[PDB]
Design a protein around this ligand. Structure first.
Ligand SMILES: Nc1nc2c(ncn2[C@@H]2O[C@H](COP(=O)(O)OP(=O)(O)O)[C@@H](O)[C@H]2O)c(=O)[nH]1
Length: 180
């Protein structure tokens, strides 16, 4: 809220919020993870050979993990699923060949009745690349237009230069600050 003062904030919301990173592998969770600083460094395994990370920040929780068809599932992802209160989808702007893969994963994920009331956000990571897709083309490409209006928002960014990352969270914070 404050952090070295800087500027008087107004965020007073706290109606349960837990932002997790969902999407295709290599989308840019590694770069974004470091950006979040990583509150409580926790390393656990749901089953067989699945690597999941969990961190806690005061009240807001955060969890990162990849997803895909070839990927399996268990009962650990479900437990945290409902408990989760923040759904943020991040795809690769330079991986068009897999953009559909991200859409499908998002399609099945968004079909969770327990997540029907969760805030959904899309982030494009790799806008610094000269051959990277734009949020507009990405939005239409991933069928972002196919989803009802209000569910999620889309924004292009570059994980390397940090351009778009700050404005993306700041904006997201406002939406989370004003609850209907
Ligand atoms: N050009 C470019 N490369 C990026 C960007 N973000 C991440 N990368 C690189 O793309 C690869 C995948 O990033 P990563 O965050 O590890 O994806 P993850 O496997 O989903 O965590 C790494 O080599 C990153 O350095 C970006 O915005 N632009």
């Amino acid at each position: 809220g404050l952090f070295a003062s800087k500027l008087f904030s107004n965020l007073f919301g706290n109606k349960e919020m837990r932002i997790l990173m969902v999407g295709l592998d290599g989308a840019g969770k590694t770069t974004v993870l470091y950006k979040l600083k990583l509150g409580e460094v926790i390393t656990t395994i749901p089953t067989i050979g699945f690597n999941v990370e969990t961190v806690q920040y005061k009240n807001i929780s955060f969890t990162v993990w990849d997803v895909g068809g070839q990927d399996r599932i268990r009962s650990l992802w479900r437990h945290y699923y409902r408990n989760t209160e923040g759904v943020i989808f991040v795809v690769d702007s330079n991986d068009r060949s897999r953009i559909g893969e991200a859409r499908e994963v998002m399609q099945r994920m968004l079909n969770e009745d327990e997540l029907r009331n969760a805030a959904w956000l899309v982030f494009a990571n790799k806008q610094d690349l000269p051959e990277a897709m734009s949020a507009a083309e990405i939005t239409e490409k991933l069928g972002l237009h196919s989803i009802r209006n209000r569910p999620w928002f889309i924004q292009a960014t570059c994980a390397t230069s940090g351009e778009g990352l700050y404005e993306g969270l700041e904006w997201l914070s406002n939406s989370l600050k004003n609850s209907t």
